[PDB]
């Protein structure tokens, strides 16, 4: 238990815990993370039968900022950046666990690149004929949003009347669960249900009803290019997509009562070179202008202490099965091949 910590409350993590793995309870995994976790980390949780996250400085710094957030001031945009596989996504997940355990409303977009590529059913929006709806993407997110924030969905009540069809319409004063359920049940109305959910939460957080965390991973997708093409085969632009148009509005710092934590990702990005990782290189001019002012937070490769704890955690679970891995000579090779990169180390240790 050298690599593990007994403090499982993300609100009590400090610098003493750097390098130690804290256990996320199975209940939190089902509720707080129906979809946020990286795909290969989800495999580890299945194989090890436990979700343990290393307390690192990038999250510790960003948890400190969120503990001292002035809810009166406009929401601050925190941007996690760093090289490929350094731990940006799992740093964002550590923070989401903190805010989720403090009864914040979580608006977690697991990957914004999925909204700008590989769309089979791009339907023209009825609310605005110049914008396109993404029924499958909206419905998928709505189901998970319902799971994470089921507790609050009854308390939050819409403050307007929303006309779905000629026949159906949501009335003022009904719970927000109804809007979420309509989008889930009727998938043609899912994109508009997401727009309303985002519109209602932004307004009602400023009124002081709840604290809203906007956790968008892969945010650089919003101001980039799309691979979605019209019927005439002309390239569609991100602004025309309804889900992107509505999420962009959440990114502006014109509301208060919460924080906006985002993470960059070149993985899954469109029209970006492999080694692009700095904010302006990935966000672009339009993206940087939208987020400016923001607080960049660097995520780096494991430091010597962190690297040792990661190997100890794998050894404690018996994941490293090669007879030379536990030895000092093996560890030196593990370090050189990855260079302390968390993702390369996990991928190399997966078959040893």
């Amino acid at each position: 238990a050298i690599s593990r910590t007994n403090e499982n409350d993300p609100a009590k993590h400090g610098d003493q815990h750097e390098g130690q793995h804290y256990n996320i309870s199975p209940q939190d995994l089902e509720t707080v993370f129906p979809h946020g976790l990286p795909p290969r980390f989800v495999m580890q949780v299945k194989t090890f039968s436990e979700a343990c996250l290393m307390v690192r400085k990038p999250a510790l710094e960003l948890l400190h900022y969120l503990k001292n957030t002035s809810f009166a001031y406009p929401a601050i945009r925190y941007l996690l950046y760093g090289e490929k596989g350094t731990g940006k996504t799992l740093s964002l997940c550590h923070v989401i666990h903190f805010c989720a355990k403090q009864d914040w409303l979580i608006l977690h977009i697991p990957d914004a690149h999925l909204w700008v590529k590989n769309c089979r059913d791009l339907l023209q929006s009825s609310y605005n004929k110049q914008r396109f709806d993404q029924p499958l993407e909206a419905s998928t997110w709505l189901k998970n949003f319902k799971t994470t924030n089921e507790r609050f969905l009854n308390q939050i009540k819409v403050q307007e009347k929303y006309v779905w069809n000629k026949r159906e319409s949501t009335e003022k004063g009904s719970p927000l669960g109804e809007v979420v359920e309509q989008g889930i049940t009727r998938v043609r109305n899912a994109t508009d249900a997401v727009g309303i959910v985002l519109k209602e939460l932004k307004r009602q957080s400023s009124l002081g009803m709840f604290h809203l965390l906007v956790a968008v991973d892969g945010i650089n997708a919003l101001w980039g290019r799309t691979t979605l093409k019209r019927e005439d085969k002309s390239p569609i632009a991100p602004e025309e997509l309804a889900l992107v148009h509505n999420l962009r509005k959440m990114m502006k710092n014109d509301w208060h009562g919460g924080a906006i934590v985002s993470a960059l990702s070149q993985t899954g990005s469109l029209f970006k070179p492999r080694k692009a990782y700095l904010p302006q290189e990935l966000l672009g001019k339009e993206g940087f202008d939208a987020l400016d002012p923001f607080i960049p937070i660097l995520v780096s490769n494991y430091n010597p202490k962190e690297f040792e704890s990661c190997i100890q955690y794998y050894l404690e679970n018996n994941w490293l099965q090669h007879e030379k891995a536990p030895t000092e000579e093996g560890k030196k090779e593990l370090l050189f091949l990855s260079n302390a990169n968390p993702s390369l180390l996990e991928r190399h240790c997966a078959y040893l």
Binding site: E83, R274, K275, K332, E333, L335, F336, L337, S338, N339, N341, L344, H348
Partner: protein
């Protein structure tokens, strides 16, 4: 700054590398100004970079700065391996240098692409032969 270093050269196929090995370091390697795990995403290439230092059991004790031009990813890694090994000979003992030579780490690989000859499909590949 008074830090000992040894420049060397290597060659593999059409690639040519120049490696500066510092007597003391932390194990940092920079290829064309880029960290080696970024410049060499393929694991096989990084394994070749580790072969010289591992064989003499000096991983993490030297800082290397190399520049490689020409060839492909594998040829560049092979060229850098030769450049690093020859430069690192300055800091290892004479006996260790002999072991490096006997392990294949100090020989320039002469295997280069063979030309294509006229009347044939390839360097050795012949056109289909028809007895009748």
């Amino acid at each position: 700054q008074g830090m000992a270093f040894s420049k060397s050269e290597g060659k593999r196929k059409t690639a040519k590398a120049e490696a500066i090995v510092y007597k003391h370091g932390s194990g940092r390697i920079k290829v064309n100004g880029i960290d080696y795990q970024l410049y060499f995403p393929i694991t096989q290439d990084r394994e070749q970079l580790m072969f010289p230092f591992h064989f003499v059991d000096r991983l993490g004790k030297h800082d290397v700065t190399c520049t490689v031009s020409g060839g492909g990813r594998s040829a560049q890694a092979g060229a850098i391996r030769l450049a690093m090994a020859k430069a690192l000979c300055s800091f290892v003992t004479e006996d260790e240098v002999e072991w490096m030579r006997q392990a294949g780490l100090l020989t320039t690989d002469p295997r280069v692409r063979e030309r294509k000859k006229p009347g044939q499909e390839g360097a050795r590949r012949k056109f289909t032969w028809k007895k009748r």
